[PDB]
Amino acid sequence: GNNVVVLGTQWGDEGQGKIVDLLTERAKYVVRYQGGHNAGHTLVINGEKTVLHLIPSGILRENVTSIIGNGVVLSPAALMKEMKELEDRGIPVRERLLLSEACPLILDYHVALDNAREKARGAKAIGTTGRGIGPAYEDKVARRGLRVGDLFDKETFAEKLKEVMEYHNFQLVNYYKAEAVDYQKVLDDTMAVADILTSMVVDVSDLLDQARQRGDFVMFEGAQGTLLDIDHGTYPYVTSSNTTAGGVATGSGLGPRYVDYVLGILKAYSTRVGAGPFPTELFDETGEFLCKQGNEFGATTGRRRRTGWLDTVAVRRAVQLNSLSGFCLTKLDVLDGLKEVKLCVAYRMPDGREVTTTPLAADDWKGVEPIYETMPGWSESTFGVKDRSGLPQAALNYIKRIEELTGVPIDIISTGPDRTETMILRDPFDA
Amino acid sequence: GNNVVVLGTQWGDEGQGKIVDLLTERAKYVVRYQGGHNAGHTLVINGEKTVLHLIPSGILRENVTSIIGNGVVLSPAALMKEMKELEDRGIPVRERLLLSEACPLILDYHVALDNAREKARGAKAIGTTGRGIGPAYEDKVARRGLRVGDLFDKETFAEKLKEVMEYHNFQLVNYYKAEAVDYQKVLDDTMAVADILTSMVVDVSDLLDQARQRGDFVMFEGAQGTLLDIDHGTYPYVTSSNTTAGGVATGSGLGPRYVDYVLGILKAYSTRVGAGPFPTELFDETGEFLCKQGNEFGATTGRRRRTGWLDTVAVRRAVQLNSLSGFCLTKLDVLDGLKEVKLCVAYRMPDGREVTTTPLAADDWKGVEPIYETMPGWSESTFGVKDRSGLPQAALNYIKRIEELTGVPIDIISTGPDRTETMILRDPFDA
Ligand SMILES: Nc1nc2c(ncn2[C@@H]2O[C@H](COP(=O)(O)OP(=O)(O)O)[C@@H](O)[C@H]2O)c(=O)[nH]1
Ligand SMILES: Nc1nc2c(ncn2[C@@H]2O[C@H](COP(=O)(O)OP(=O)(O)O)[C@@H](O)[C@H]2O)c(=O)[nH]1
Ligand SMILES: O=P(O)(O)OC[C@H]1O[C@@H](n2cnc3c(OP(=O)(O)O)ncnc32)[C@H](O)[C@@H]1O
Ligand SMILES: O=P(O)(O)OC[C@H]1O[C@@H](n2cnc3c(OP(=O)(O)O)ncnc32)[C@H](O)[C@@H]1O
Ligand SMILES: O=CN(O)CC(=O)O
Ligand SMILES: O=CN(O)CC(=O)O
Ligand SMILES: [Mg+2]
Ligand SMILES: [Mg+2]
Known part of the structure; x- marks a missing residue:
């Protein structure tokens, strides 16, 4: 599709930055549509790291025009600090960036x-x-x-x-x-x-209507994750904007019928920074291993990220809320060297009922317990692998399982922070 | 399409109520996704008038389940007052209505x-x-x-x-x-x-995901109009919710890729209640005629509505913002008996430049003048006509002209307040 949406299917920090920088290679535009400088997206090219907050992730590709859409809450101070920082590094920010x-x-x-x-x-x-x-x-x-x-x-x-x-x-x-x-x-x-x-300043809505008519490739960059959505998240433990796919149109001016593919970034295990329900949260050694191997510290506050197992119940709420077309499974390499890995397939409600649907407001999650499926882990290093062939069967199974449980194909798999340590099984722009 | 969106392409009061009550005849659900009881939608069936504020417009059809979605700001007092009022009239509100x-x-x-x-x-x-x-x-x-x-x-x-x-x-x-x-x-x-x-209470997002999968016919009812949109309207002279089509997903939980048809309600002349830019506003006898013949008084505050000529420049911003699939031209009958009728095709900017695009924030409209195309009016009564055949050529021309200027087909034409004084040239549910 021409208009592709990339967003975090969890509680943020799933790895949207890397994915936007990577897919923007064929894009004319990149649009942030919600949030502000609370986000912190890490791009890593050939070892060189860039952390963006307010500036869109296509900022390093001179072929892409970066746009800060109307949904974004913009700090002039914040913008200036990032601009100076990127310009000092040879990135002519003012030529590539436009705003609403x-x-x-x-x-x-x-x-x-x-x-x-x-x-x-x-x-x-x-x-x-x-x-x-x-x-x-x-x-x-x-x-x-x-x-x-x-x-x-x-x-x-x-x-x-x-x-x-x-x-x-x-x-x-x-x-x-x-x-x-x-x-x-x-x-x-x-x-x-x-x-x-x-x-x-450019008239963003009119600009995107023109791109759309020209069949130009456009990428919409999400901020935060689905469960942090002001309306559908674990309220009030949320961000103040809609992080779900509808925010794409409210925050950019593009008609909702023009979204062609919604790519949901999925981390492989879960992390949350900030207070809030977190059913699959781990407070044990494996939780500690997760934080450690995955360097889970907020790219904006430096705060440590709570880690846990992938929760297919929460992810399924994201599937429906965002009309996912496919997923980008990220941080698999982090699971390397675990005897077993588990994923939450259902929730035990405090009243005893088994459920496969998530509660809404934070309070309604109060005594919910996660019910798991424990699968074999894998000792082989999957880091930097760019071919499924190079993944062990335990890793592929975990993958098929997730697709099974969600009903959504994993079109891209990320195996490291670098732009190129990834396998694109299916490019959203071609679908 | 299965999922049809009905919204006001102007500044509200275009006639969404009538259109929702009419098309819901084949729908399973009707969903309000934004606003609150500021709206005031008039249904008129066989002479019997109903004015809804917070309660969705499918409320009179027992075959439809009415849903107040999460985007809606809900007043318990307001709900109770309308419920009692409708129940007294034989409408078992509690059986047909669900909420988020x-x-x-x-x-x-x-x-x-x-x-x-x-x-x-x-x-x-x-x-x-x-x-x-x-x-x-x-x-x-x-x-x-x-x-x-x-x-x-x-x-x-x-x-x-x-x-x-x-x-x-x-x-x-x-x-x-x-x-x-x-x-x-x-x-x-x-x-x-x-x-x-x-x-x-029902889990609206999950409910709509289920309807969608069953291919159920769903109707989304807009509130207010496009130019009152918190983000894209004549800020700050606006309402606090997104009235544009992206609000459909933020306020209901349905994935944005599931909107099949967006029907934009278009009045035939313009009205605005509340302060704000209004380029084609008429302060003369024709403006007075408009108010009068079209009974333009706010169905909620009783305040008089400012009237003016149809503004194709503003309507074109609505076309792109909402990905209109078609229009519903309403209140044509009101133009009956006018020597001429005009429509705004461009704006003269205070700096002299001619433009066909609208400014954003209210202040940026400060000295804009509308440039018109004056067409012949028609003396024949078009009231209650249900066949194009029954419309005079001047009326049909005005119609073709609007399509020409906008690039969007007028799929439905309304000729009176009653549910049946309308011609459906093309049913959104079939497209
Ligand atoms: N090991 C590993 N790190 C990754 C991978 N993808 C991204 N990262 C890194 O993981 C972090 C993602 O966190 P953050 O940048 O805050 O996520 P974002 O806000 O969605 O972009 C950064 O440290 C990235 O460099 C991957 O597949 N493997
Ligand atoms: N004469 C005439 N009145 C109409 C027509 N369609 C709707 N109305 C009436 O026009 C008004 C529409 O205003 P309002 O109900 O506030 O609009 P809404 O909020 O979009 O539903 C009500 O008085 C309707 O009964 C039409 O085609 N002709
Ligand atoms: O009002 P706010 O300051 O936004 O905080 C509300 C809640 O949202 C969390 N939070 C905000 N932005 C986040 C982000 O950005 P990216 O994924 O885009 O890099 N990633 C992870 N968590 C994030 C906050 O920590 C708190 O739980
Ligand atoms: O914060 P608010 O109280 O919503 O007011 C902000 C502005 O929005 C206007 N306004 C609000 N709702 C409106 C409505 O509803 P329906 O078309 O759905 O029947 N129709 C017309 N104008 C409407 C107000 O008059 C003011 O200009
Ligand atoms: O990457 C951004 N987040 O983790 C937000 C934070 O650091 O608080
Ligand atoms: O029909 C509703 N509007 O006109 C709002 C109002 O009456 O103020
Ligand atoms: Mg981050
Ligand atoms: Mg009204």
Whole structure:
């Protein structure tokens, strides 16, 4: 298909970055449609590592035009920091990147609010990335937030920012009893970059309608994972945007009937960073092995990632929510050297009923237990293998099993962080 | 197609209700996926009028199961009022309606906030429907809002509501200097209905995945119109949800690749209620004629609707944003007896450039002028006509012209408020 969607089928960090950088080789565009700089996607080319937060993952291919879509909450400061960092490395960011005037802006006060709210929650802290994600989304939805388009008239912007900050500062000092964020300070910082931001504005929806008509290859880059979806995730332990496939159209302007293939990135075992239900979570040596071998530390907060076994019950909710066309099984190599590997095929509800469907809000997961299928592991190193032939039968079985349980074909398998340690069994762009 | 989407291509009130009630005749389900009780859809059967707000439009057909999807912001009070009203009229609401445990709840404090914010905006008041729509969406996105699922444990709900209301009451009295909303009062009112709400909960995403697999006919009912979309509309003069087609998946849980046909409801002339750009707006006698003949008063606030000429430039933004498959031209009969009728084919930008594309945020519409094509009107009454044969050539030309300008076929034409005063040239369910 022409329009391919790449998203995390779990709770983020499944390996979308690597997969976007890899498939973009034939793409004209790459579009981020939700989230902000809470994401942290690692590209590794010939050993050279790049971690992107807000900048789309096609940024290293000069043949691709990177687009930050309207669904994205955009921090000017964040953008500037990543730009300078990539430019210093020879990546002419300003020539490859475009953005939406409809993108809300994340300013220092959103960070102050996120921290305050997080503090206020005490024991029940969501465990957010400390960027002002949610607050920026609140402002958007309240219709008081500033957007990239507002920079098109600095005087009027200055007026708008004053009103908003006075509003939020009132709450910050009187209610949370936190320090106020300085108006002038934010105003100045933002104006210093305005012209750069503004210089990259394109009408994204019209642009994508044109690409679509030309049959151009487009890639949509997800952020976070399905179970972190504001609507369908383990609420309130979630991110504030829709991480599921419908977010592709809300956050880019492309008509929903133009999605041709939805590629769901699937890790091979599970990880979650932040508070929240996690049925297959492991607190034993194997959990520790998982973290270790898979270097599971948040590419944005550096926080350690909780690890567990692949949960086919949760993954099946992702299948239906996102109309998966296929999966990209990632981090298989990490399972190398395990006597056995298991996957969750059902959930035992606290009331005794066996179920193969997941609960919705976090509280409804309270006493659910995972029911497993334990399969043989494999001692052979599968790292960097680019051919199924090079995978042991235990590895292939685990693979067939997952397809069986989900009803979705594993079209791509990743065996290491490098762009090329992968086997593409079927290229989404050809399907 | 099996999954058909019906939405307003303008700024709401295009006539979605009538169209949903009509096409649902062959449908198993009807799903609202965004908005709340700000909508006001008028069904008219054999002269008998029904105005729905939160309850889906298939509610009068016992063969259809009505579903309030997760994208919808749900007011328990609002639901109860409409239920009692429809039940008194013989419509066994509780048997035909189902809802999502993921739907946020709109409580009295959201109304108090909406009014406060609206007051605070002074001259720049959005002109909202006075329901707590935006505030309920803010709470959702902030992850502090209550949802239908929270009612599954009344003690814990009571705890949660206390925290939230204390938070909002603080803002209401200290900052807006408005009266506080009573905790106990809201708690009691909400608990009185809890069991009823809770009794209608179904897992909507899984339900729709099952319908889809059975090839069941499903209809998705839009609320508001494209230009009121939180992301793509004339921001901030908008509603807080995505009214565009991507909202179908975010607000129902159905995979975006399962939308088969998107039917865009198109009024024949334009109307807008609430503040906001409106290029083709008429302040003359013809504008007055439009309001009058088309009884243009908000079916929810009773406020008068601003009227103007059909704007093909704005409609073309809706074509691309929603991947329209076809249109339903409504209220043609209203144009009866006009020497001429015109439609906007382009916009003159304040800088002199001619454009056929629309600006995004409200401010970017500031001095845009509409450029028209003036066509002959028709004196013949087209009211209640169910055959193109019964339309005069001037009416048919106007029709061909619109298709020409948009590149989208007008599959259905409505000629009066009654369910049957319509011509279906092509049934979305068959395409
Ligand atoms: N060993 C191994 N590491 C991988 C593989 N694919 C990706 N990685 C690495 O795993 C991590 C993925 O985490 P993150 O970058 O936060 O995921 P993302 O946000 O979805 O892109 C990074 O460390 C990648 O370099 C793979 O197949 N094998
Ligand atoms: N004269 C006329 N009225 C119509 C037609 N279709 C719908 N209506 C009426 O027009 C209004 C549509 O407004 P509203 O119900 O608020 O629109 P909705 O929110 O999209 O359903 C109601 O008064 C309907 O009864 C039509 O083709 N002709
Ligand atoms: O409001 P937020 O600050 O977004 O936090 C809410 C919740 O979401 C988690 N979280 C946010 N972004 C994440 C991410 O990005 P990528 O996969 O794109 O690299 N990967 C993993 N977990 C992520 C947070 O840790 C917390 O549990
Ligand atoms: O936060 P809100 O209270 O939703 O208001 C924001 C803006 O949106 C307008 N508006 C909201 N719902 C509308 C509706 O519903 P239906 O077409 O479904 O019948 N039809 C027309 N205009 C509508 C409001 O008047 C204001 O301009
Ligand atoms: O890769 C990004 N995440 O793991 C978010 C974080 O580091 O908190
Ligand atoms: O039909 C519903 N609208 O016109 C909203 C309103 O009455 O304000
Ligand atoms: Mg990451
Ligand atoms: Mg209406």
